[PDB]
């Protein structure tokens, strides 16, 4: 009971560093789709002043 | 559930464990107030708890030893813990045995042959006792025939298994917990 | 019933993707690493060519 | 072929004489409450752990 | 059989602590959700002004 | 998408082996400005140093595998490869170099598996950062001859072996009983009637 | 002297691809530029042969 | 050549695999059982009675934690996969080709010798004795075998030879008349002349492959002497045998239980390699066992009886692999060096001359 | 069952309870006077105290040793419960290891496909050895395919597996009461 108790606990503060890391690598990939948005409208409008 | 062959502190702990079982069912099915809940769900929060009263002994010695002397629409907190509190502590609701429910399907079973017809079983349900709404019967016959459409008869044997089965992983599942609490400095 | 639903939506089980299905997201990941790769070797191939 | 086992003799063991030989009735009723739900305390922070 | 008072009955603080945590993490989502309420709120007037 | 996501991951890849560099020159400018007295650091704080360093450079050993396995620039390719290739010789370089500072407890181990948790732990990453899986371009990369040798082999095992199939590791079992058809036959009829018996009188 | 080749490298590939623009080069393929300057060596040893 | 080799079954396509594939992990409290190892050798310091800490020091220091099989994977592939798969590497590092395993019977030597050859693309010529019984009966079959391996790697790069059961042709010599085959053991003369000659190019991606299953059988200082280094695999520890525990059945694709105590499996089945467990997997759960899995749950029992089947490792045969690691490792031999003191002096040594 | 290496006050908790047992074996076999049963369920009651006595065994050295100093078509409670304690103390007639009936039915199974023709297992059981009557073929047969009709093969690790456990759970049933039980000063 104790030895699973200690592993448990490893384990799982494992698992939290992995989803801290997780969160941070979705934080700047969303960031990043905003930027990827953002040049996209910017090719738009460049699209229709060259149009124009 | 409750052990009255205990120390006085095991007594105080296991009352106290009934109110916060009893606390934690409330809340999570209070739908909008928090410390109000439908009496409806009562005898539901009891079966989340273990306790087996019948409808009859519900209505007659459950809600009126809780509700309030002014109707309310719905139960709180304060008559709720008090009363299964109580009711564990004296057993009052306990279901029988699982050797009653093989001697009750033995009884609908008047030849022995090990199974009963569906149609007998829901000629029971909802002409006596307690009779079943029609949408419980096909759920019985659901899990009895274990989601057989087609199915005619049920083994009677194979689903009290079950049924027992399962309720010992649910009083498992509720008992854990039934333990700690300690008083308070 | 209700302790799977906290189990999948507060997150007791994970929810296990089975690569054999169509549209498991390693499959969207190995294909577009197969594209990707081929693209090397086709840059590789016409780079030579160009040189 | 089957190397049968030796039908070795049986453990019989010896108790050994550790702090398990102390004191009477009244004091192990008193240890009784001293191990009786706690080790649960340990049990049950592994399963806390585990749900975590 | 050492079964209620320093061995095997402190399940009770299992499940009124995994409560506690659910309690506690309950009101942490919520403001949370407040907080994407209120993120959703201001990206939907950006995006909607921007129509 | 891979394009751009791969630049960043060599931009990155790259930020940790310059850190890297100004890190470890680091102390030779310090040396120099300082180079009149003796040294007096323990193996402990080297230790910490090359483990640290072993662990950047192997985090920059994952990006850049990762990148030339996906990095469509044949131009590019070229640099990735042979700066990865370099990566990886100082990274052996820097175990080894751990390896004989593992003079840890007032000793001379001079083993081949320092132990680097304690700093794992206090640089706030799993164990699994550790990993190095092989790379799998060695077989791309002048994958002709290799080709052509399994090809040969393949056509000689056909020659002889008449089977194509990679063999997988026959254990052989100890659970064989030396034992002709009629004494299992006996066994098994013992066993029938022994159980047969057994549900007659239990009727 | 590794540690010099991988520094150099990175300093050479700063230079020379970090300072190039793929916007009008979309697709990330070689660059007309690069194949001329690395491809000098080639032409100008097979006139010095043959010279 | 290569012919004839295809038709002596020398070399063989072993199965691909990846080094990814050894499931380990991180030496967590290695460190920790460092540290313990050591406090325990100086409270055996402290100790009065001379016969006691004679017995204590005469079985093997258990308090070193053996080397993590994260460890294991890391040196590996630094070693094989980099100077193999890559000759620059090759160049710029040390100039090794000779590798030496011990380790129990399918602890995993050739799960890594599968991931090496599928990774690096290589052929591997097996001339171990029980891969090539029933083959050679003379020392010129034996000779000619070795040197054709021998040009086949040189000429076919990358190549990579593994043997096992090297205890027969280097064990212990005064030891009773093992029933293997005497013309193994003379394997050593010409391996013998062949490492003294410095045969493969150090920067020929060639490597030879030593993995036995008994270490002690072996002469320590050949094999300390012979080989560019070794590698000692431990048995399993409870994390890392469990999380193997859960992959395997995770393989036979069986269903997870929430309430299962895994440590507790890991407990009963300590002392077993990596191969009985494999075996004990594989034995449990059968065709028509795989698809009842679902109307009956996994049962601890079931592996009760499997664990027994498969080969047994006693204490006495981990205590011996660790001596055995740290003697040819010479780890022993830092032990006795940070010991002696320096006060003993080098006086009188001529007047017993008669 | 019995454990021969027990403390000699745990040797004769054993016996007696192996005593009663035996008895109340034979009060089950006892059809018209107790202390007297038909010899042809000699081997049947050695089932029930552990034993799987082969015919041939039984018929060569179980029969003549029951047996009195004439022969007698029943057999007396004096002269079985002696024998019948010996016996199981001994485990002379003991089921074998059930590795050695894997063993066995993987021999049958030449191609090691992990089954077994019903027609083989028949001519096997019917041609070799002990031959068996149609009635206990068809009992194997039956209880091998778990009562299935539509089988057409048995395998034989699934059977054995089950018939190991029926065996267990028959002994484990036949021993209960054995921790109650107290010997008889």
């Known amino acids: 009971e104790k030895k699973l108790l200690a592993f448990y606990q490893q384990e799982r503060q494992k698992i939290n560093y992995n989803w801290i890391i997780a969160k941070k690598e979705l934080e700047d990939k969303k960031s990043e789709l905003i930027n990827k948005e953002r040049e996209i409208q910017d090719l738009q409008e460049n699209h229709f002043m060259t149009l124009n | 559930m409750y052990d009255p062959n205990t120390s006085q502190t095991e007594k105080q702990k296991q009352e106290e464990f009934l109110k916060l079982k009893i606390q934690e069912a409330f809340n999570l099915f209070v739908k909008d107030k928090k410390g109000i809940v439908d009496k409806r769900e009562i005898p539901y929060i009891m079966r989340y708890l273990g306790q087996f009263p019948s409808e009859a002994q519900v209505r007659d010695a459950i809600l009126p030893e809780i509700e309030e002397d002014e109707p309310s629409e719905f139960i709180k907190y304060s008559k709720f813990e008090p009363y299964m509190l109580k009711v564990l502590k004296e057993r009052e609701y306990e279901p029988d045995d699982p050797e009653a429910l093989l001697a009750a399907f033995k009884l609908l079973d008047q030849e022995g042959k090990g199974y009963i017809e569906i149609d007998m079983m829901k000629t029971f349900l909802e002409k006596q006792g307690i009779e079943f709404r029609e949408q419980e019967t096909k759920s019985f016959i659901e899990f009895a025939t274990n989601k057989d459409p087609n199915a005619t008869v049920i083994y009677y044997e194979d689903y009290i298994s079950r049924l027992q089965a399962f309720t010992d992983k649910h009083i498992e599942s509720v008992m854990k917990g039934y333990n700690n609490f300690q008083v308070k400095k | 019933d209700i302790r799977e639903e906290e189990l999948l939506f507060l997150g007791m089980k994970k929810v296990v993707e089975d690569p054999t299905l169509p549209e498991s997201q390693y499959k969207q990941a190995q294909n577009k690493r197969q594209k990707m790769k081929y693209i090397q070797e086709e840059h590789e191939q016409e780079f030579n060519d160009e040189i | 072929m089957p190397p049968k086992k030796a039908k070795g003799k049986k453990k019989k063991e010896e108790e050994p004489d550790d702090e398990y030989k102390s004191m009477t009735g009244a004091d192990l009723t008193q240890t009784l409450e001293k191990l009786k739900e706690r080790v649960n305390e340990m049990r049950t922070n592994r399963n806390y752990i585990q749900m975590d | 059989a050492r079964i209620k008072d320093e061995q095997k009955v402190v399940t009770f603080n299992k499940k009124k602590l995994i409560t506690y945590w659910r309690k506690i993490m309950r009101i942490a989502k919520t403001e949370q959700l407040k907080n994407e309420i209120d993120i959703y709120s201001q990206n939907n007037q950006r995006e909607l002004d921007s129509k | 998408m891979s394009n751009m996501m791969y630049n960043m991951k060599w931009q990155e890849a790259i930020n940790d082996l310059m850190e890297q560099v100004t890190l470890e020159y680091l102390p030779l400018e310090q040396n120099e400005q300082q180079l009149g007295m003796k040294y007096k650091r323990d193996s402990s704080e080297w230790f910490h140093f090359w483990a640290t360093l072993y662990i950047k450079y192997i985090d920059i050993y994952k990006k850049l595998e990762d990148c030339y396995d996906q990095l469509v620039h044949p131009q590019k390719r070229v640099l990735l490869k042979e700066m990865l290739e370099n990566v990886i010789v100082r990274l052996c370089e820097t175990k080894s170099q751990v390896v004989k500072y593992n003079t840890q407890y007032d000793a001379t181990y001079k083993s081949d598996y320092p132990n680097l948790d304690e700093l794992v732990m206090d640089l706030k990453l799993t164990p699994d950062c550790l990993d190095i899986p092989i790379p799998r371009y060695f077989r791309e990369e002048d994958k002709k001859r290799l080709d052509e040798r399994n090809q040969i082999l393949d056509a000689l095992l056909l020659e002889y072996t008449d089977t194509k199939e990679p063999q997988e590791e026959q254990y052989e079992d100890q659970n064989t009983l030396q034992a002709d058809m009629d004494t299992a036959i006996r066994i098994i009829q013992r066993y029938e009637r022994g159980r047969q018996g057994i549900e007659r009188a239990n009727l | ?51 | 050549i290569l012919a004839g080799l295809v038709e002596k079954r020398v070399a063989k396509k072993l199965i691909p695999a990846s080094l990814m594939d050894l499931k380990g992990e991180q030496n967590v409290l290695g460190k920790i059982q460092e540290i313990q190892a050591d406090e325990n050798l100086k409270k055996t310091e402290a100790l009065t009675d001379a016969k006691l800490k004679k017995a204590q020091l005469e079985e093997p220091s258990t308090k070193m934690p053996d080397p993590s099989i994260a460890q294991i994977r890391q040196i590996i592939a630094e070693y094989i996969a980099f100077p193999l798969g890559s000759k620059y590497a090759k160049e710029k590092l040390d100039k090794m080709n000779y590798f030496f395993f011990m380790g129990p019977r399918g602890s995993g030597k050739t799960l890594a010798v599968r991931a090496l050859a599928h990774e690096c693309n290589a052929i591997v010529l097996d001339i171990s004795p029980s891969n090539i019984d029933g083959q050679y009966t003379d020392k010129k079959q034996i000779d000619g075998m070795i040197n054709s391996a021998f040009k086949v790697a040189k000429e076919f790069q990358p190549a990579i030879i593994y043997c096992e059961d090297f205890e027969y042709i280097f064990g212990q010599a005064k030891k009773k008349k093992s029933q293997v085959n005497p013309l193994f053991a003379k394997m050593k003369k010409p391996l013998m002349d062949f490492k003294k000659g410095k045969f493969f190019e150090p920067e020929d991606r060639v490597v030879f492959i030593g993995s036995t299953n008994r270490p002690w059988d072996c002469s320590q200082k050949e094999i300390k002497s012979f080989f560019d280094k070794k590698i000692y695999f431990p048995f399993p520890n409870y994390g890392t045998r469990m999380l193997l525990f859960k992959t395997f059945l995770e393989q036979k694709k069986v269903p997870l239980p929430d309430n299962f105590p895994i440590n507790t499996i890991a407990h009963i089945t300590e002392g077993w390699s990596a191969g009985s467990f494999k075996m004990a997997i594989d034995r449990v759960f059968t065709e028509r066992r795989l698809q009842k899995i679902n109307e009956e749950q996994i049962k601890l029992s079931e592996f009760i009886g499997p664990l027994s089947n498969v080969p047994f490792t006693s204490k006495e045969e981990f205590k011996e692999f660790k001596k055995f690691n740290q003697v040819v490792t010479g780890l022993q031999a830092n032990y006795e060096a940070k010991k002696a003191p320096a006060d003993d002096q080098k006086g009188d040594k001529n007047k017993k001359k008669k």
Not at chain 7, 3 to 31: A, C, M, P, Y
Not at chain 7, 46 to 51: E, G, H, L, T, Y
């Open chain 7, 1 to 51: 002297p590794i540690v010099l080749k991988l520094q150099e490298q990175i300093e050479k590939h700063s230079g020379e691809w970090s300072k190039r623009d793929e916007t009008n080069n979309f697709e990330q393929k070689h660059e007309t530029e690069l194949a001329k300057m690395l491809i000098k060596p080639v032409v100008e040893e097979q006139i010095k042969q043959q010279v």
